[PDB]
């Protein structure tokens, strides 16, 4: 029961945010099917975002959890595919913890909408 246009500057301003702390630009775009090969075998959705910058533009989050869900994605799909000594795996945990920072905050301006 709130405004849309807000909401979705909110969204836009928190993805922003939640990209930022990707530093090394991991999460960015799709995991290259054609880099690797494999990766299909082991996860069922794929997230990363760019898909969901554009799942946002298409008024796909309508609510906190919608855009969460798909910034999980992102986070668990990395720490599926990849093993704990790399990297890509503590890149994810690093994401989990300091992008679930920004996100309870981001959540908490839309619960006073
Ligand atoms: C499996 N994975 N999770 C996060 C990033 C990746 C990944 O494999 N990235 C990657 C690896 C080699 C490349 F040439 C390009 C990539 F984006």
Redesign the pocket.
């Known amino acids: 029961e709130m405004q849309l246009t807000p909401f979705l500057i909110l969204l836009r301003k928190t993805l922003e945010q939640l990209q930022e702390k990707d530093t090394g630009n ?2 960015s ?1 799709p ?2 099917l054609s ?2 090969p494999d ?1 299909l075998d082991h996860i069922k959705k794929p997230m990363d975002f760019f898909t969901m910058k554009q799942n946002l533009e298409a008024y796909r989050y309508l609510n906190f959890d919608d855009f969460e869900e798909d910034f999980n994605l992102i986070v668990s ?2 720490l599926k ?2 093993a704990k000594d790399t990297i ?1 795996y503590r ?1 994810a945990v690093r994401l989990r913890e300091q992008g679930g920072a920004v996100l309870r905050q981001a959540r908490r301006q839309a619960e006073k909408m």
């Open positions: 991991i999460f775009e995991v290259p880099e690797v990766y799909n990395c595919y990849n890509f890149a």
